[PDB]
Amino acid sequence: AKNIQAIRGMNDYLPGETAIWQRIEGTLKNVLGSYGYSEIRLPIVEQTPLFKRAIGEVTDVVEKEMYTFEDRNGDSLTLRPEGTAGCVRAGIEHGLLYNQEQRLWYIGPMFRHERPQKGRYRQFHQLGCEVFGLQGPDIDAELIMLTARWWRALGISEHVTLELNSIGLDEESREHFAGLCKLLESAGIAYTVNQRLVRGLDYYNRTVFEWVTNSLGSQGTVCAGGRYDGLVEQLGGRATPAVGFAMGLERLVLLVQAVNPEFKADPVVDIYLVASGADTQSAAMALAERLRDELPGVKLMTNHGGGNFKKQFARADKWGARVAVVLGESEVANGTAVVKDLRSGEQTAVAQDSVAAHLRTLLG
Amino acid sequence: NIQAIRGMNDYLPGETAIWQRIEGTLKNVLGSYGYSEIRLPIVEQTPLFKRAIGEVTDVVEKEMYTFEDRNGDSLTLRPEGTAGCVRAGIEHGLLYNQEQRLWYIGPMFRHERPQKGRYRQFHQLGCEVFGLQGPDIDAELIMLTARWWRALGISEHVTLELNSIGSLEARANYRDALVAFLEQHALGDYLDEESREHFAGLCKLLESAGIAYTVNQRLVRGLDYYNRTVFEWVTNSLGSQGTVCAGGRYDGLVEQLGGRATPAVGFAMGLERLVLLVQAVNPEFKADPVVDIYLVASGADTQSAAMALAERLRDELPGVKLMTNHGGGNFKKQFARADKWGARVAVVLGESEVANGTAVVKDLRSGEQTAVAQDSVAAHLRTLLG
Ligand SMILES: Nc1ncnc2c1ncn2[C@@H]1O[C@H](COP(=O)([O-])OC(=O)[C@@H]([NH3+])Cc2c[nH]cn2)[C@@H](O)[C@H]1O
Ligand SMILES: Nc1ncnc2c1ncn2[C@@H]1O[C@H](COP(=O)([O-])OC(=O)[C@@H]([NH3+])Cc2c[nH]cn2)[C@@H](O)[C@H]1O
């Protein structure tokens, strides 16, 4: 017997912390849903040439970060360090791009071999967004408006700055960049043009932006994206315009918990089901299942493994149950169930056929 | 151009939709039982899988995707989730003298020959409960699954196979007999006393719940950490290679992996097999369109107007899916794009409308369009959509 630890730089998100993640995620997804964007799920592993061909060879990602390995069949495989390439790839592969428009988003883990700190993980997660078929600066502005809406939704708008600039400058890129700035101004979105802003990836053409934070609630940048009109062709498909971005969920989760500790998730248990005595378990479990039928949306946990009423009532407190449906030998024979409000301590005996209604009132 | 690694799929917008509807329902039912989500790393030290799953098992022998890290360490993309789960639990002190009712969803990697229900990158939704011994929690897990089947309406196409493989002793006693017969040419008979009680109590609980099962004495799982209770939910619609959900006890794994002995039980399900079984048995488990309202808008400097009205309508109509057309196009092109997405209504925004402060609300299903003041469109849409 020995202990195996987690690969350094790879994290486990425990029960308490995932509850926050679930809230933040759903909010993000909900807003994406309101703009008409569809979800696409892509492979964690792709062939190495994809990342070499797309990201660029003199990039520090390709140079020193990819987690690459050789498959049983000699093929070199690489665990995705970002997600646009795979997207484009899947796009070209199923023929979703040629003379079509797609507004997609994706979420999942990315991998990069890096020396961990505040916001640098070896296994990290991105919410990414990509649109195909639209060139003008209009769509460029829609994406920024979308990010903007996310900040407001999460209550962190006063902690993210927007950086902007074009790496085309040539005439066309100027008109296009100007139009973008102008849409932003109209939207009342506050920006800062930065001449030295260039992304670490070699596939961006005109537009390049970045939302940043000072709380280092991220690693500075929290979201970053840009346009890449040539990547579809470069990877073997007919030329199509494209733009998107991806955000560091860990950074985001960090920024929110910092800007507003007033954020919380619903507790896990609403009702705890205490039961003790000879042959009560089947009764208790049968009741629990009925309460589940009648009370859709209630989080009810059935104690298991015996324990006296004192221990069980304490388990109810551990979980944060507000109500406790109790049931011993008597209740079972009499066809009742003791409903105990753990907040006021007021318990009452109710006929089982009426417990659902009672709980309903106690929970609001 | 590059293709995808064989045995690893892409889930497109169309099907993605069916996955989220199925996943939600799953997560919702897990929530109604008080189970918490836990998230674990996709890669772990190879020795964990070797230690946990067993050396002479098919997974370890020929399916894992191992490789070396820059520092010499052996890394393995997980082929299952229980090991990572137990590991993370011992590592953060979540199991000692504690109870947990966890679940997780994610990818699992196995190097197998791709078939109808076998892929190299597959997804599991699993459940692990630590700290409870008796057959009660075992029965709960089986009921949890039954609720899912009903929720998804495939209850009629999934059977339950059950079996007890007793304790270490019984299995080490069954060897002599088994092996002896093997050299030459039943498990239930070497089952220690304690294991027979446990399995009977378990069975006694399922009958009462009205859950139908079938004891299968040749049912052993393909992993080596399991102890008493063992089960699999199987479908004849071959929506899978057969088995859609499978699990069992594994009381000794937490200690073996270097922690204090705590009991544990869990299971994991193949989402692909499930999604397949559902689309099969439930012919039209239709998901809703990605677009409700499409925003037409052509004319001089109309876009800032359109994008602005669009932002307002999102604030007023939370829940609606509204897509703002982009890249120009004549009303004819745009109305077509609306059809493409399946928008039921279109709010048109020409040059007049900008000036007159109106917007035309076009009911795509009946063609009857009307001009409404912008302060009243939200209310107008609200009605058209019900
Ligand atoms: N090791 C890490 N640990 C934690 N968070 C990290 C790590 N590396 C990057 N991030 C997060 O991911 C964001 C985007 O990463 P990137 O700068 O490599 O660009 C891109 O990925 C492009 N794919 C953006 C894109 C998508 N579509 C178009 N352009 C960063 O701003 C940061 O929040
Ligand atoms: N290549 C594949 N493609 C698609 N689906 C697949 C593939 N391999 C396995 N599955 C799914 O994973 C389930 C569990 O099969 P398993 O025998 O690998 O055991 C286990 O995973 C145990 N760890 C379950 C467990 C957790 N806790 C206790 N027992 C199968 O019933 C099937 O639905």
Chain centroid to CA B378: 37
Chain A / chain B CB contacts < 8 angstroms = 249
* Non-local CB neighbours of A123 within 8 Å, separated by 6+ positions: A7, A9, A10, A11, A109, A110, A111, B41, B42, B43
**Element containing residue A225 per DSSP (H, E):** strand A221-227
Other residues' Cβ atoms within 10 Å of the Cβ of residue A350: 18
**Ligand 1 pocket mutation, candidates A7, A113, A124, criterion most atoms within 8 A of CB:** A124
Q: A177: Cβ below 6 Å to ligand 1?
A: no
Helix axes B271-281, B13-31, angle to 10 degrees: 100
Q: Do the first three CATH levels of B1-287 and B288-384 match, i.e. the same topology?
A: no
Give B39's contacts in chain A (Cβ within 8 Å).
12-13, 18, 21
* CA nearest ligand 1 atom 26, residue: A245
CA atoms within 13 A on the CB side of B104: 25
What is the DSSP annotation of A180-219?
Answer: HHHHHHHHT---EE-TT---SSTT--SEEEEEE-SS-SSB
Q: Is A217 in the pocket of ligand 1 (CB under 6 A)?
A: no
Query: Considering only CB atoms, which chain A residues are within 8 Å of B99?
Result: 315
- Give Cα separations from B170 to A136, B167, B178 (angstroms): 72, 5, 12
The b/e string for A275-299 (b: 16+ C-beta within 10 A; e otherwise) is: bbeeebbbbbbebbbebbeebeebb
Q: Which long-range contacts (CB under 8 A, 24 or more apart) does B178-187 make?
A: B186/B217, B187/B163, B187/B217, B187/B218, B187/B220
CATH number for domain B1-287, candidates 3.30.930.10, 3.30.565.10, 3.40.50.150, 3.40.30.10? 3.30.930.10
d(CA B43, CA B109): 10
Q: How many residues are listed for chain B in this entry?
A: 386
Nearest C-alpha neighbor of B246 from the set B227, B236, B232: B232
Is A95 touching ligand 1 by the criterion CB < 6 Å?
Answer: no
Contacts of B19 in chain A (CB under 8 A): 41
Q: CB neighbours (10 Å) of residue A304?
A: 25
Alpha-carbon distances of B383 from B92, B287, B297, B370, rounded to whole Å: 52, 22, 22, 13
The span from the CA of A101 to the CA of A10, in Å, is 36
Whether residue A248 has its Cβ less than 6 Å from ligand 1: yes
Q: How far is CA A305 from the centre of its chain?
A: 36
As assigned by CATH, the class of the A266-362 domain is alpha beta
Strand partners, B208: none
Rounded (5°) CA angle A28-A32-A34: 120
Spell out the domain ranges in chain B: 1-287, 288-384
- The rounded distance, in Å, linking the Cα atoms of A152 and B153 is 39
Residues 6 or more apart whose CB falls under 8 angstroms from that of A130 comprise A84, A87, A102, A104, A105, A106, A242, A243, A244
* Residue B32: other Cβ atoms inside 10 A: 22
Atom 18 (ligand 2) nearest CA: B80
Contact B121 A145 (CB under 8 A): no
Is the Cβ pair B42, A38 closer than 8 Å? no
- CATH number of the domain at B288-384, out of 3.40.50.800, 2.60.120.1030, 3.40.50.2000, 3.40.50.740? 3.40.50.800
Backbone angles phi, psi at A126, to 5 degrees: -120, 145
DSSP annotation string for A147-181: HHHHHHHHT-GGG-EEEEEE----HHHHHHHHHHH
- Give the whole-angstrom CA distance, residue B357 versus residue A19: 44
Asked if residues A151 and A205 have their Cβ atoms less than 8 Å apart, the reply is: no
With contact defined as beta carbons under 8 Å apart, do B236 and B161 qualify?
Answer: no
B74 Cβ neighbours under 8 A, 6+ residues apart: B45, B46, B47, B66, B67, B68
3-state secondary structure of B334: helix
CA–CA dist B49, B259 (Å, integer)? 16
Residue B228, token pair as written in the block:
């008493």
CA of A31 to the centre of ligand 2 (A): 34
| The token pair that represents A187 in the structure block | 């939207």
* Whether residue B222 has its Cβ less than 6 Å from ligand 2: yes
Residue nearest to atom 32 of ligand 1 (CA): A248
Q: How far apart are CA A296 and CA B179, in angstroms?
A: 52
| Ligand 2 atom closest to the CA of B243, numbered from 1 | 31
Could you count the other beta carbons within 10 Å of the beta carbon of residue B69?
A: 16
SS3 content of chain B, % helix, strand, coil (to 5): 40, 20, 35
B151 CA to centre of ligand 2 in angstroms: 22
CA closest to A296 among chain B residues:
B32
Which residues of chain A does B38 touch, with a Cβ-Cβ cutoff of 8 Å? Answer: 12-15, 18
End-to-end CA distance of chain B: 47
Q: How many residues does chain A have?
A: 364
Instruction: Tell if the CB–CB gap between B111 and A235 is shorter than 8 Å.
Output: no
How far, in Å, CA of B383 to CA of B386, rounded? Answer: 5
Q: What 3-state class would DSSP assign to A301? A: strand
How much distance in Å is there from the Cα of B385 to the middle of ligand 1?
Answer: 39
Interhelix angle B136-152/B13-31, nearest 10 degrees = 140
Q: What is the CATH number of domain A3-265?
A: 3.30.930.10
For residue A41, give the DSSP letter: B
Interchain CB distance below 8 Å, B41 and A7:
yes
Q: Which residues contact B182 (CB under 8 A, 6 or more apart)?
A: none
d(CA B258, CA B251): 13
Task: Tell if the CB–CB gap between A3 and B91 is shorter than 8 Å.
Answer: yes
Helix (H) or strand (E) run with residue B275 in it = helix B271-281
Q: Are A306 and A257 spatial neighbours (Cβ–Cβ below 8 Å)?
A: no
Helix (H) or strand (E) holding B103: strand B100-109
Ligand 2 mutation pick, B35, B100, B102, B108, max ligand atoms within 8 A of CB = B108
